[PDB]
C-alpha cells in the first residue's frame, strides 16, 4: 500500500501519462503481488500438494487408492445402496486414503482439508438393483477456487462426474475378476485342471494392463504438468479452464474406443460367474459331467473375446485405426 | 496397500539375505541404519512402506516385521553390525543343534517338531499384530540343515493353519557342482512341501547363481555373505511395484493372479539386469532401457538353471517384467507396449500373448550411476530340467547308502521311505504336464 | 481470583470426572431410600447427607465454590427415586459471561447416566458382603447362584461405566483445558463450552440406560433380603427366576457396549425396546 | 482415592518389599523419603496417592498407613535406612518367642497368639483414625516361618472379626526347585488357611520371579532384595488407576468382585511388561502398542508359573488389564474391545465373555522415559499346578522323616497332622468347582 500510494502521487505530476513511466510502476506492483500469490498458494494452502492429491482421489489418478477402496466397499456395494450405505461408504473412502499413505502422516496432505473435503454420494445411476453402479464421489471446492466453480451452476462439476463413472465401470468389472480368479487359485476348493487356470488368469492380466496405462499414462502425466506450472510461477482460474479441456477430450475418447471393448467385457464377466459356480461344486460322477460341459463352453467364449481384444489392442498401438472407428459407429 | 506382510527368516541363508534386504530398503525409503524415523524425509508418500514391512515402537524406532529362526552364528553377527536395529531379541528364536551349513534336512525337521510351540508363539504374536494380513514370505535355502528342514516343517503347519493366505518363497535349490551328495535328500523331501504348502517358489539354483556372484561382484574369496548380497539385490527389485502407490500391482489378489497361472505350475525363474544395484564393484552399470530389457529375455543372465536357449524349451507360460526408470518414462512406456505385441516366446493353443508389465520408479538414493534396471519373473517350461537332474542325483546316493544316519534320526525316514516314492510318482506327473504346455495339446477345445 | 484453579475444579466435580469416592459415599448412605419410589422425608435426608459428605473430607482445594454452591435439585417433591435426582449449581463470580440455562441442564444429564451405573455397583457389592457372614449359612443351591450372578453382573456394569467415563467425560475435559490454555481469547471459552454441549446432546439422545437397570435393582434387593436370612421351595423359585432374568440381560448388555464406541442409533433402538419391559 | 487401603507386612520379605514400595511411591510424586509434604499439586488434586496409602498426623509430613511385623533383622534394616520416616515407632514391632520362627509355620503361628492383644491395639487404632476403610492388603511370603505362620494367623482373625471387609493378599509362594527344604511344609499348612480365610489371593511364584529379576534386570548377586524390587513395582502398579485421577468411581471392592467370582476361585495370576513400568531398576524399552498388548495375553512372560500358551482348557474365568500409558484414550479403548473379541484368553458360553480394561496415565513427576506398559490380572483355572507341586514335594520330605524336627516344638503340627490331608481333599473340591464354571451346571436349574 505505501509503494502504490507513492506511485500514484508520481503519476499525478505527469500531465498526461507516458507509457514508459506507467509500465515501470506496474512491473514493480506486478512483482510484489505475484511473489505474494505464490507463497499464499504454495506454503499455506499447500496448493501443489492439494492439486496432486485431488487428481489421485477424484479422477482415480491413484490405482492403489482405488484397489483399497473397492476392497472395503465390496460388501456394502454388493447389496442396494440406501441411507445407511452412504455413511458407511464415506468412512471407507476416508479410511482408504490413510491406508494408501496419502493422509498417514503430515508429509502427505493432512494439513489441508481438501482430501477430507471429499464425500461419497449415492445417486441412482444405472441399476438400483446393485449399489455398484449408484456410487459416485463428489468434491466440494474451497476458497479461492470456489469463486471459479461451485455447486450452483456446476458445469465443471458435471464433467468430472461423467469421467469418474467410465473409469470406475472398468474398475468394477476388474474387481470382480480379481477376486473370482483369486479364490480358485487358492488351494483346497490333470489336463482339465491348469487349462481352466491359465485362461482365467490371462484375462485378469489383460484387463489390469489396460487399466494401468489409462490412469498412469494419460491422467497422471497431463496433471503433473498442470501442477508443475502452478508451483513454478498464475492463478486458480487458469487451472480450471485447462482442466475442462482435459475432461472433454477424455469424454470424446470414451465413446470412440471404449464400443467394442465393453461389449466383449460384459460377456467375459458372465463367463467368469459361470466358471466359479461350477467350480465351487467340485470336490461324484455328476461333478465330473458338469465339469466337461463347463470346460468346453468356457474356452469357446474366451476364444471369441480374445479375437475382439486383439483388434482393439491393434488400434491402441496405432492411436487410430480405421477399423475400430467403423465398429464403434455400427454399435451406436 | 499398507497391509502387512510378515517375513520369515530361516537358517543361515535367510538371516544373511534378510539383513541386506532391510539395509537396502532403508536407503531407499530414506531412514537410518537402525530404522529411526526422520521427520522432514518422506517414506509415507513415496512409499506405502513403514507399515507393510515395518512396525513402529513407542520410542519411534521402525523395526521390520520379521521372525528370525536359526542357530547362534548368524543372530550374533547382525547385532555386532550397525544393522542391529532391524532385528529385535524377541523376534529371535534360537536353536543350538539344528545347525549345519551343509545338507542335513532331517536334523532340522526333527528340531522343529520339538520346539513347535515356541515358534508357533512367535508366529501368533506377529499375526495378532497385523491389521490387514496379505500373507507370508519365507527366505531360506533348501541347501542348509537349518534353512532346509525347519523351513519345510513350518510350511506344512502354515498350510494347515491358513489355506487362503499367500505363501511365497524365495528358495535357494542346492547347487549341482557341489561337493556333497546329500543334496538329493534335502531337495526331494523339501520339494514335496514347496509345491503343495506354498503357492510360489522362485527358484534360485546355486550352480548358476554362484557364478553370477563370482563374475560380476568380483569377490576375492567366496563366503555365505557374498552370494547372499547378490540375492538381496534381486529380491528388493521384485517388490518395487508393491511398494509404490499408483500401481494396482499393490493389491494381494492382483499379484497372485498375474504371477501364478496354475496351482501346480508355479515354479518361477528370475533374470535381472544389471545385477549390482547398491553394491557396485564394476566400472559402469549405466545403460539405455533397450540393453537391459533385451537382456531380460535372455536365459544366459539368470540366477537359476534354466540353461541356454538351444536344445531347451522356449515356451513361456507367462512373462512379467518389472520396470525401473530414472530416465524418460515415455521411451520405456512405448517400448513395453511394442514388446507385448511382438511375442518373443512361442505360443500354441494353451495360452497366447502372456506378457505383462509393471511400471515402478527407481530411486537414485541407492548408490548407482543413475542406472535404469528391470527384473524379469517368468514361468517357463525349461524349469523341469532342475527337478530332473535331482531325480538322477537321488538314485545314485540311494545306491551308495551315503550318510543315511542323520536322516533316520528324523521322523520321515523312521516312518519308511514310502513317502518319498509316493512323491516321486506325483512329481513326474507334474513334469509331464509342464512339457505338454509346450505343444498345442493342453487346450484342445 | 485464581480463575484457572476454580476452572479445573468445575470440570472435576461438575462434569463427573473425578469426584468419585464422595459420590460413592453418597450412594452407600442413600441406598435404602433410593430403592423406594419416593417418600416425603427423602429429599430432606438427601440434602443433609449431600451437604454432609462435602463437610467431612474438609478442605483440599483453595476454593470450595464447588462444595457449597452445588445443590441437589428434585423434579418432584422439592420413574424411581434415582431418576428424580438432579443438580443445580448456583455458579461462582466472575464466571457466568456465557452461562445460559441450557448448560447446567446438560452437565446434569451426563451426571445422571453415570450416577445410576455407580449406584447399581454399590448395591451389588453390598449383596456379596452379606452372603459370607453367619446367618446365611448353607454352604445349597442359593449360595452357588449368588456367586454366578455376581460375576456376570459386575462385569457388564463395569464395562458400561468404563465407556461412559472414557468416551465422554474424560475425553471432553482433556479438550477443554487445551482450548483454554493456548490463547487468552474470551471467544475460545464460549466455543469450548458449546462444543462440549453438542457432544452432550448426542449422548442425551443416545442414552436410555436407566429403565433396564431400575428393573434389575428391584429384583436384586429381593434376592439380598432372602440370602441374608436362614433358608424351602421359595428360595428355589427366586433362584430360578434370577438366572432367567440374567440371561436375557446378558445379551442386551453385550449389544450395548458396541454403541458407545460407534455412535449409531439403530442397535440402540433395539436396546430401548428391551429396557422398557423385558 | 478416598477409599483407604491398610497395609500389613509380615515376615522378612513383607517388610522388605514394603519399605522399597514406599520409596517408590515417594519418588513418583516429587516428595521426600521421610515422607515430607511437598506436593506440587495440593491445590487442584492431581495427587491423590497421599491418601489411599498415606495418612496425615499433623507432624507436617505424610506417613504411610502401614504396620510392619516380624522378628528383628528386617525391622533393624528399615530403621537403619532413611525410609524410617514412613514408620512411626508404634508401626515397628519386634516380638519373637522361642527365638524367631526359624522357618516354621507352627512356631510362627504360636508367636502371634501370645501377643495377640498387642497386634489388635495397632489394628483398632489404624481403622478408627481412617475416614472410611475399604479393606486390607497383605504383603508377605509363604516361604518362611514368620511370613507364613503369622500371616495366616492374622488372616484368620480378620475374616472372623470382620466378614464384610475384603482381605486381598499378595502371597509370595516359594520356589518349586526349593531354596530351603522346609518351605513345602510352610506352604501347605499356610495355604489351607489362605484358601478359606482369604477373600482374594494374588499368587506370585518366587521361582519365576527370581529368574526374571536375574536375567532382565541384571545386577551381580540377585538375593531377596533384588527380587523384592520386582515385587514393589508390581504392588504399585496394580493400584495405579484408582490412586491417579483418571478413574475414581472404581473402587477396591468392585474391582475385587469382577475379578473374583467365588472365594474358592479367587486365585489371580499376574503378567507384567516391561517388568517395571515405573522404573526403579534399570533398562528402558520401547516396543509398539500392538506388540505390548499381544505380550500381555501370553503366559511365557509372567511373574508366576502356570502352563505355557494362551487359551487353556482350564479357561480364563475373567481378565482385567490395567493399561498405563500417556498416549490418547482412543487406542487403549479400541484395543481392550478388540482383545476380548479375538479370543486370545479363552471364553465360554454359559459364563459370557468377561474381559474388562482399566486405563491410566503415569505421574508427570515420575521419570520421563515412559512407554506403553501394563499389568495383567486374570483369574485362570490353571493355577492349581503350583499347589499340587508343593503338596507332592511336601509328602516326600515328610515320608523320609527328615526336616520334621523344626515343627514339632510348636503345638499345632505336633497335634494336628489332619491339616495336610485336609488341604488335599480341599484342593480336589476346588478343582471340581472351577470346571462347572465353564458349563451351565454351575448351579442347578
Swiss-Prot record, chain A:
The chain holds residues 424 to 846 of 846 of the full protein. Interacts with TUB4, SPC72 and SPC97. Present with 56 molecules/cell in log phase SD medium. This is Spindle pole body component SPC98. It is found in: Nucleus; Cytoplasm, Cytoskeleton, Microtubule organizing center, Spindle pole body. Belongs to the TUBGCP family. The gene is SPC98. It comes from Saccharomyces cerevisiae (strain ATCC 204508 / S288c). Involved in microtubule organization by the microtubule organizing center, the spindle pole body (SPB). Probably part of the microtubule attachment site at the SPB.
Swiss-Prot record, chains B, D:
InterPro entries: Gamma_tubulin (IPR002454), Tub_FtsZ_C (IPR008280), Tubulin (IPR000217), Tubulin/FtsZ-like_C (IPR037103), Tubulin/FtsZ_2-layer-sand-dom (IPR018316), Tubulin/FtsZ_GTPase_sf (IPR036525), Tubulin_C (IPR023123), Tubulin_CS (IPR017975). Tubulin is the major constituent of microtubules. The gamma chain is found at microtubule organizing centers (MTOC) such as the spindle poles or the centrosome, suggesting that it is involved in the minus-end nucleation of microtubule assembly. TUB4 is an important spindle pole body component that organizes both cytoplasmic and nuclear microtubule arrays. The keyword Thylakoid does not apply. Keywords: Cytoplasm, Cytoskeleton, GTP-binding, Microtubule, Nucleotide-binding. Residues 33-56 are annotated as: Disordered. It comes from Saccharomyces cerevisiae (strain ATCC 204508 / S288c). This is Tubulin gamma chain. GO terms for molecular function: GTP binding; microtubule nucleator activity; structural constituent of cytoskeleton.
Curated annotation (Swiss-Prot), chain C:
Keywords: Cytoplasm, Cytoskeleton, Microtubule, Nucleus. Signal peptide: none annotated. It comes from the Eukaryota. The keyword Secreted does not apply. The keyword Secreted does not apply. One of its GO terms (cellular component) is mitotic spindle pole body. It is found in: Nucleus; Cytoplasm, Cytoskeleton, Microtubule organizing center, Spindle pole body. GO terms for molecular function: gamma-tubulin binding. One of its GO terms (biological process) is meiotic cell cycle. Present with 2230 molecules/cell in log phase SD medium. Interacts with TUB4, SPC72 and SPC98. Belongs to the TUBGCP family. Involved in microtubule organization by the microtubule organizing center, the spindle pole body (SPB). Probably part of the microtubule attachment site at the SPB. This is Spindle pole body component SPC97.
